[PDB]
Enzyme design. Structure first.
Site, PDB file in Angstrom:
ATOM      1  N   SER A 169      -8.853 -16.832   2.404  1.00  0.00           N
ATOM      2  CA  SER A 169      -8.375 -15.740   3.239  1.00  0.00           C
ATOM      3  C   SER A 169      -9.471 -15.383   4.221  1.00  0.00           C
ATOM      4  CB  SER A 169      -7.950 -14.503   2.433  1.00  0.00           C
ATOM      5  OG  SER A 169      -9.064 -13.839   1.989  1.00  0.00           O
ATOM      6  N   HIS A 195       0.861  -1.164   0.000  1.00  0.00           N
ATOM      7  CA  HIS A 195       0.000   0.000   0.000  1.00  0.00           C
ATOM      8  C   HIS A 195       0.913   1.234   0.000  1.00  0.00           C
ATOM      9  CE1 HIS A 195      -3.867   2.159   0.276  1.00  0.00           C
ATOM     10  NE2 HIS A 195      -3.250   3.029   1.099  1.00  0.00           N
ATOM     11  N   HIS A 196       0.448   2.339  -0.626  1.00  0.00           N
ATOM     12  CA  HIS A 196       1.231   3.562  -0.687  1.00  0.00           C
ATOM     13  C   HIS A 196       0.491   4.815  -0.221  1.00  0.00           C
ATOM     14  CE1 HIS A 196       4.294   1.573  -3.145  1.00  0.00           C
ATOM     15  NE2 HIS A 196       3.272   0.880  -3.605  1.00  0.00           N
ATOM     16  N   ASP A 208      -1.689   5.328  -6.879  1.00  0.00           N
ATOM     17  CA  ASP A 208      -0.449   4.626  -7.219  1.00  0.00           C
ATOM     18  C   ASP A 208      -0.029   4.824  -8.651  1.00  0.00           C
ATOM     19  OD1 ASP A 208      -1.016   3.749  -4.687  1.00  0.00           O
ATOM     20  OD2 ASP A 208      -0.796   1.577  -5.189  1.00  0.00           O
ATOM     21  N   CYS A 240      -1.421  -8.651  -8.196  1.00  0.00           N
ATOM     22  CA  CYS A 240      -2.734  -8.113  -8.451  1.00  0.00           C
ATOM     23  C   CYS A 240      -2.600  -6.953  -9.411  1.00  0.00           C
ATOM     24  CB  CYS A 240      -3.477  -7.703  -7.174  1.00  0.00           C
ATOM     25  SG  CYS A 240      -2.756  -6.216  -6.390  1.00  0.00           S
TER      26      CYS A 240
END
Ligand SMILES: [Mg+2]
Ligand SMILES: [Mg+2]
Ligand SMILES: [Mg+2]
Lengths: 326, 320
Positions: free
Chosen positions: A227, A44-45, A113, A106
């Site tokens: 998950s 993540h950013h 991003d 992904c």
């Protein structure tokens, strides 16, 4: 049965960045002792939703600190980085760790991003497909060359060589039917969403199998993963309140990340409650899907101490009872 | 003077990339318990003269596997990379290791790589400089916000923010007068290269002093580094022959526009290669020439592992 521990590196309101990073380190290191064979790292950013923007680098650290633990990305946002640099990263991880790296990929969900890294989000699908073909060529052949609409570069020798024949094992976060199909055409395992129910999981795998089979892959040997958001506590309601409170903060952070420039009933379809409740939910999914790789995220649990406590209760009271599909 | 090791990770048809990487890790484990205080990683792409294209990734692994040594990128090429990726990664290494990472960076030395990465060489230095600005902004403030000829995007937090106040320690490769002058102005420490001649390193050292004084920068406390190759053998001739084979392709790749023999002979006599006596004298001369405070050595050209460890041992004892 295999078990994975997901680390989001999410920054909840009550923790500083430094605390979050220290916890990332500690949680990674405690996973193996808690019976997890793999640690999965999310990318993540620029926002508190996840502080780890470079999972290859965090994976390197964790792999360097361990011997038998596998470490994977769940998942790298494929399109936003140069495919050649990413192939070098993956082969380095593969070689340094002696085959313990797992390459989850992904398309990418956040426009920010693409904006900063200079990629066209509108073409994320094409880009993911293109980048994958280039990386796989490097993994397989030791060289990579490109001359297409997305990218162009001369043929180069790719160092170092892949440790694992064909490159580190790839996993895919399939967010769409088309992504499911794309994965199936290549016989790649998927990492299933924690916000869809059993029926939806079975449907997705049915779509996948149809394709994979057509291609000749043995669908029974593909390492798909289930998950889950996980909170184990002898006090059912307690686990549930914690989970609900956490997701509150977390969902907001999610929305915020989508705009810088479902999840609610989640608890009902996830191992959140007593260990017995957790067994029941997970076994329902195993039974319907035949999957034997269970990936859980325990960060909603609280402090590092509470998270570890939850991991240990899952380990002692959940793990031993789950059974492979009959 | 402080002492450390660096890894070139050169491979060949006999020494595969798998083998050199394994050797690097084993060496790292070996020296972590000695007096050497830094482990640095060399960046190379697309040739046998260096199998690590992502020094920050390797630094991460090296940090996870050791406890004492500082770990550094030796010459991470910022010019050909996205500066936000570099800042995020360096900050991440600083955080994960609680300050044990040092940021050695560099401008691009291979025009081919600039071309590969679609970066024009005509505005190379400008590019380099804007990259560093973005990285440094992040390091010092946690954010960046460029609007220039190369990068333009909204203000962003570069996460995670650094663990070390002002970011991890930095040092820049002395690759041109231009970079050297730029560093002196910023008061940044340099890393003088093992592959440059002593005359060239002295020239850079002099220029740096001259520019710093001219701009009134206090560099009295800056500690420059020097890298040197070490190959010791009582049979000095065998040491030079072995280093020659090891360096042949590098000279052909990186020093194509210069006489091969002449360059090879200079590298063999100027680096710390030969008998113990020759090797040590060369090293003294190289330090004197450039005035570096810290010495990073590469022992990789010694194929015999036992000999290599014995040489590392003699060197260590001699610091100690
Ligand atoms: Mg606090
Ligand atoms: Mg299987
Ligand atoms: Mg003789």
């Amino acid at each position: 049965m295999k078990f994975g521990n997901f680390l989001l590196t999410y920054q909840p309101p009550e923790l500083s960045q430094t605390e979050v990073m220290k916890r990332l380190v500690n949680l990674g290191k405690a996973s193996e002792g808690c019976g997890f064979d793999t640690v999965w790292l999310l990318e993540h950013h620029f926002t508190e939703f996840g502080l780890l923007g470079n999972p290859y680098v965090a994976a390197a650290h964790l792999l360097g600190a361990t011997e038998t633990l596998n470490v994977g990305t769940a998942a790298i946002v494929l399109p936003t980085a140069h495919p050649v640099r990413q192939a070098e990263d993956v082969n380095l991880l593969d070689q340094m760790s002696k085959g313990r790296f797992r390459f989850g990929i992904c398309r990418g969900l956040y426009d920010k991003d693409f904006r900063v890294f200079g990629t066209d989000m509108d073409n994320s699908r094409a880009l993911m497909d293109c980048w994958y073909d280039l990386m796989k060529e490097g993994f397989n052949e030791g060289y990579i060359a490109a001359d297409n609409e997305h990218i162009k570069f001369p043929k180069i020798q790719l160092n170092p060589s892949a440790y694992t024949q064909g490159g580190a094992p790839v996993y895919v976060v399939a967010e769409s039917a088309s992504t499911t199909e794309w994965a199936a055409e290549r016989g790649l395992p998927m990492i299933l969403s924690w916000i869809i129910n059993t029926h939806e999981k079975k449907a997705q795998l049915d779509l996948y199998n149809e394709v994979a089979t057509e291609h000749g892959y043995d669908v029974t040997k593909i390492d798909h993963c289930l998950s889950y958001i996980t909170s184990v506590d002898h006090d059912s309601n307690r686990a549930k309140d914690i989970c609900r409170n956490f997701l509150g903060h977390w969902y907001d952070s999610y929305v915020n990340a989508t705009k810088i420039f479902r999840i609610d009933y989640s608890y009902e379809i996830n191992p959140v409650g007593t260990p017995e409740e957790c067994i029941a939910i997970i076994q329902q999914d195993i039974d319907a899907t035949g999957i034997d790789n269970i990936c859980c995220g325990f960060e909603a649990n609280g402090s590092e101490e509470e998270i570890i406590a939850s991991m240990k209760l899952f380990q002692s009271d959940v793990m031993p009872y789950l059974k492979e599909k009959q | 003077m402080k002492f450390g090791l660096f890894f070139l990770n050169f491979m060949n048809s006999k020494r595969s990339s798998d083998q050199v990487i394994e050797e690097m890790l084993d060496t790292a484990h070996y020296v972590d318990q000695l007096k050497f205080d830094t482990l640095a990683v060399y960046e190379n792409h697309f040739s046998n003269n260096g199998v690590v294209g992502a020094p920050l990734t390797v630094a991460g692994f090296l940090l996870g596997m050791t406890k004492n040594a500082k770990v550094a990128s030796l010459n991470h090429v910022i010019t050909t990379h996205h500066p936000v990726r570099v800042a995020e990664e360096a900050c991440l290494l600083d955080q994960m290791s609680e300050g044990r990472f040092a940021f050695g960076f560099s401008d691009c030395e291979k025009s081919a790589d600039m071309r590969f990465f679609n970066r024009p060489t005509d505005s190379q230095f400008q590019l380099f400089s804007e990259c560093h600005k973005i990285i440094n902004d992040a390091f010092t403030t946690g954010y960046c916000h460029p609007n220039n000829d190369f990068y333009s995007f909204p203000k962003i937090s570069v996460n995670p923010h650094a663990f070390t106040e002002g970011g991890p320690a930095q040092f820049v490769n002395a690759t041109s007068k231009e970079v050297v002058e730029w560093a002196a102005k910023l008061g940044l420490p340099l890393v003088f290269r093992w592959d440059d001649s002593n005359a060239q390193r002295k020239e850079y050292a002099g220029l740096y002093h001259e520019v710093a004084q001219a701009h009134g920068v206090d560099v009295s406390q800056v500690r420059h580094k020097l890298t040197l190759l070490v190959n010791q053998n009582v049979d000095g001739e065998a040491a030079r022959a072995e280093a020659r084979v090891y360096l042949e392709e590098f000279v052909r790749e990186s020093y194509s526009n210069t006489d091969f023999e002449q360059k090879m002979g200079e590298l063999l006599s100027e680096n710390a290669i030969g008998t113990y006596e020759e090797s040590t004298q060369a090293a003294r001369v190289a330090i004197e020439c450039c005035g570096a405070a810290d010495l990073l050595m590469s022992f990789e050209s010694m194929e015999d592992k036992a000999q290599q460890r014995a040489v590392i041992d003699v060197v260590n004892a001699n610091i100690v």
